[PDB]
Amino acid sequence: DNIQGITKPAIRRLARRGGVKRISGLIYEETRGVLKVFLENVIRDAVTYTEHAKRKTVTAMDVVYALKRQGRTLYGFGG
């Protein structure tokens, strides 16, 4: 139950930065589900990258390559 550590206040802050004024009561479980799906995809790709290099540690470049594969390039952690 580590997805319940993404609390109600954190999701409210993430919604405020998106410009959201009022929130339903069923938004938090939906948000947890979508975050879980996104994280599963990215982590699967990253672990594939670490496995190819015959390593036991996941580095930041594996994450960067995985994100670039999903089409979600990120600046500031290498490349």
């Binding site: 959201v20 996104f38 952690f77």
Partner: protein
């Protein structure tokens, strides 16, 4: 007291003015390790890897909430509902 909608706009300004991370770090790291347990056992993570994951995920969620707010306004509301999330994710091909 403040009327409902005052503090909401105050925090909207506050969190659109800043640049920090909005999720706690220990819960996110625990969740990342638990998810990664399904692909390979006895994995180690650099701190930079978890930091990169957190930045990417927060950016994703903020963009999704922007699309969801657009959907909510389309239907003449100010409250966001799960149907707006579903519509936004469907038009995005997710």
């Amino acid at each position: 007291r403040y009327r409902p909608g005052t503090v909401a706009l105050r925090e909207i300004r506050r969190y659109q003015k800043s640049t920090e991370l909005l999720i706690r770090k220990l819960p996110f790291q625990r969740l990342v390790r638990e998810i990664a347990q399904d692909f390979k056992t006895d994995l180690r993570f650099q701190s930079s890897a978890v930091m990169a994951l957190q930045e990417a995920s927060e950016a994703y969620l903020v963009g999704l909430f922007e699309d969801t707010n657009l959907c909510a306004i389309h239907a003449k509301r100010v409250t966001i509902m799960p149907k707006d999330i579903q519509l936004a994710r469907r038009i995005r091909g997710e």
